[PDB]
Subunit: 124 residues, 4 copies
């Protein structure tokens, strides 16, 4: 993938969370996520996909991933998806928006889903 | 997983798209997505995660998945993530919200991301 | 406004909430909202804007409005915005997505905002 | 309103857009918006609402507003809603997420709505 080497590695967001990812040649993202906030401790499995053949016109590389917030320690009965783009270079970034859905009853489903935004960098 | 059997199989949304998924015992979702709309043809790889040990209080099962819109036919330089919950029973559903990010220049990144909602059923 | 007469009046969503609105000739929306769910009772002031000169090509009419969830009875320290389009005709609809933000501390601001979707009709 | 004086005035976001607002004693927001990007020129009317009696526990003040992108110069057949919170003090901010809906045909309504996030400050 064009940005396989750029994406692969450890990333940090503005909350102090850690995103460890391997980008595969056929568009796969695999790794682990550790949130600094919320009903979470230690690492969670993540999986996702990226554009392995992005535009050559200076555009970012589209990607997304999912974490279900269950591991051996805790289960928050919730999943987050991040959708965004990798922007390579000296100060590389992944700029994302996310959707965090919890399991609800039907009566409470209107209130099932948080939205927010995370910016990941290779330092901090 | 509690809902492994319920989630696994073929799903259809209100647009006429087809979602084919296998739920794994350790929380994995793998399969293929075919959109009835947009800059897409044929099937795309998807991966994601679900809560394999949901609450037993009548709540839904939280899940999410990603599709990067590149296959052997087309590349839309974009990725969609779906975040939502599975609601089992006679008229099973997956109720989702989604984020579709395209690769953009920095100047156009404000306009990188669509949001919407899909409801999947086992018929239609 | 082209759709002034179509928008003006009483609307109901899938939750059983009631949206009472007057569309003005210069693009204003004014009225009251009563939620069937959440930390809400009775009516709340709403204000917003619509496109008073929409495209004549069969497109919908873009609009949005805000409710801050404070009235004489309760204060939920939160605001919802609805963004969507009016689609006129025998089975008129307003199709919306919404953002509901509560006041939070800085440490909890990641979790400040719910997202969802409401469909309003002139019956039910 | 507790934060009437803090909110009232001129605000700037990270795109270079300008938000001019008056906060009323009964929760109203009125003013004008000028976007630095997109299909927009000069000022547009905005209206919205804020929590005029926020929590006294260090939480932000919830608010939202709408702009329909029609003025005497241009009509983008679209509306944006911002939902967020005011955080007062030496480096006051309004932290928002937004939904921008354009009028579409029914076939294209899946793609009607952009999502993003704006941070407003009293300088820049
Ligand atoms: O806490 C979790 C798991 C960890 C999420 C951390 C997120 S992922 C996005 C962001 N980026 C990060 O690095 N960390 C955070 N899920 C429960 C979320 N709950 C609310 C919540 C709110 C405040 C504090 C703790 N929890 C319950 C709930 C879900 C849905 C709707 C309404 N309510
Ligand atoms: O079309 C695609 C790939 C297929 C997406 C189909 C979606 S996924 C969610 C929904 N559920 C489905 O089953 N199908 C659809 N990506 C380009 C999206 N573009 C816009 C678009 C708008 C209208 C028609 C076609 N394309 C460019 C663009 C992306 C971001 C921001 C702004 N603009
Ligand atoms: O309840 C309210 C006011 C009424 C909102 C009703 C909404 S508006 C959209 C939808 N359409 C309708 O007709 N009714 C509903 N605000 C507090 C929301 N809270 C959560 C909540 C969740 C479940 C039940 C009650 N409250 C606290 C909170 C806000 C943000 C983030 C995280 N958490
Ligand atoms: O451009 C406008 C009006 C101005 C919006 C400026 C926004 S408001 C949020 C953000 N904050 C700001 O200060 N400025 C920006 N509406 C058309 C948006 N269009 C896309 C667009 C994309 C790139 C460049 C210009 N336009 C068409 C369209 C709407 C919906 C879905 C899919 N596509």
């Amino acid at each position: 993938g064009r940005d396989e080497a750029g994406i692969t590695g450890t990333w940090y967001n503005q909350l102090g969370s850690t995103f460890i990812v391997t980008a595969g040649a056929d568009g796969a993202l695999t790794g682990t996520y550790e949130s600094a906030v919320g009903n979470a401790e230690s690492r969670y499995v993540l999986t996702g996909r990226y554009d392995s053949a992005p535009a050559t016109d200076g555009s970012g590389t589209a990607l997304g991933w999912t974490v279900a917030w269950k591991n051996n320690y805790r289960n928050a009965h919730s999943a987050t998806t991040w959708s965004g783009q990798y922007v390579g270079g000296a100060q590389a970034r992944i700029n994302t928006q996310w959707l965090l859905t919890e399991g609800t009853t039907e009566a409470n489903a209107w209130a099932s889903t948080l939205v927010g935004h995370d910016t990941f960098t290779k330092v901090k």
